[PDB]
Amino acid sequence: DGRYSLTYIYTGLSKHVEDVPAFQALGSLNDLQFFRYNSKDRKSQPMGLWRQVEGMEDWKQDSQLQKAREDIFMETLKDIVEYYKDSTGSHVLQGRFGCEIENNRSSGAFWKYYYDGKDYIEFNKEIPAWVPFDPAAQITKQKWEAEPVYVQRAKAYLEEECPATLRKYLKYSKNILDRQDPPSVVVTSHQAPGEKKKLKCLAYDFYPGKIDVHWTRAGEVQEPELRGDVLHNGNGTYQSWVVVAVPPQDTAPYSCHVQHSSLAQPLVVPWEA
Template sequence: YGPHISMFSLSLFFFFFAGPYSLSFLFTGVSRPKADIASFQATGFINDQPFFHYDSKSRTAEPLGPWKQVDGMVNWENESQLKQARQDIFMETLEDVMGYYRDRVAGNHTFKGTFGCEIRNDSYCGAFWKYAYDGRDYIKFNTEIPAWIPLQPEAVNTKVKWETEGSAQVSKDYLENECPERLRSYLQYSRPFLDRQDPPSVSITSRVTLGLIRTLTCVADNFYPEPISMYWTQADSVVETESWGEGPLSENGTYQSWVAVKIPSLDRGPYSCHVQHSSLAQPLTVTWNKSQ
């Protein structure tokens, strides 16, 4: 999946970029999908960034976001064939699980699998693998034992079948060896997207309801990475927040967050919104008063 680099170069590479970094996948299977929905979908993530998508309609794994411009990281033809094989196994498992619940006849059912690994300082430091059926946790993998742990009585059937087929050791090897190695390979191409620092643009909106209460909302847009701190002050005293929120990762690979306070509509302020983010050398402050 990429050019060969020496162990010295790899060690130096991670000395300066310790992480943590993660590689994870989300598989979703639907027993009776609507006409516009694929019965099987798979998405890969490096950290919080989706870097490829596959579905049963296109039967093709395709890069997403900035990875569309990256050459050499993934052999997409091979990845498509791999996901086609994974699709067949995954959908067979969904059929098995529906049988354990005696759900084969009625209704539409969903099976989701999430798995991945994390490295820090070039060393494996954790992994997970779990499945859910119709929104309820179904079975998860324990790398220490190693074994599949049923989370529903019906999942005992899956545990017995998978472990009889040798899945426990194969899954452990994948999570602790193959997954971290693949992540290291991907990071040669992906670090510019993952280590970047996009500063937030900050704005304030004011809205009066029923002529009595004014809501001041401070919005931070287009920042990366995700962690951010936002709060309001008046006369150097922190004001209790009425509400706050965070948006999902946008199509351009950045985040949005907001924090709001409610004040009397006749209050002239000033009120200040403070934003702290790793991209900022010092906290950013934006002030509102009645004249604005």
């Protein structure tokens, strides 16, 4: 088996401006985002290719769960601002938590919070206990540990529940995370009035992201003039391109090359002037 990771991220603002939710949650599996939730709609919604996967999660229930998480998250943020006696300003609390497995074996886990960009508090499941970094975090740790069961639960979440959720999801995500979609390529050239002729090789609809795309001038790999790429999450596909300017009197042969894990061998696509 391979490497898989479930990550969640919470963003809370103490004084949100118009059109920006006070609380936002998102989650991802490896390089793709699978869901989202904010304090405006208050609904957990699947995203990307997960909008078509059925029976992996009850989104109506997860909505109730996020709503609960939100309340606690924002009270935490509120208590910090209270501590610093400065609710006139705009502060943010971002939290990150998730786990990862490799070869069906749990290979790691984390749980950390940031306040106004600085490390606030994090959980060390080995102890098991919360570690405070900011003075206000001393109060927070006190609260999150007022009962013996609390740390036991936090330890249980990273060691059992989370890695469980990740396994459940991989069962319904084989047709998503394990894909090996070969790249379609399209060579095209554009002539800017006054500038050299420019050839653009585009690789698309491929996955995973790792790819090699380069032009060749009579066999000699050229140094791209421009270059870029992207990941369309709604689709779960990547696109990558390269560009080269050609002398106004160059006859040499121009062929694009593409290598990718899903290809039995590299592809080649010459440009017909």
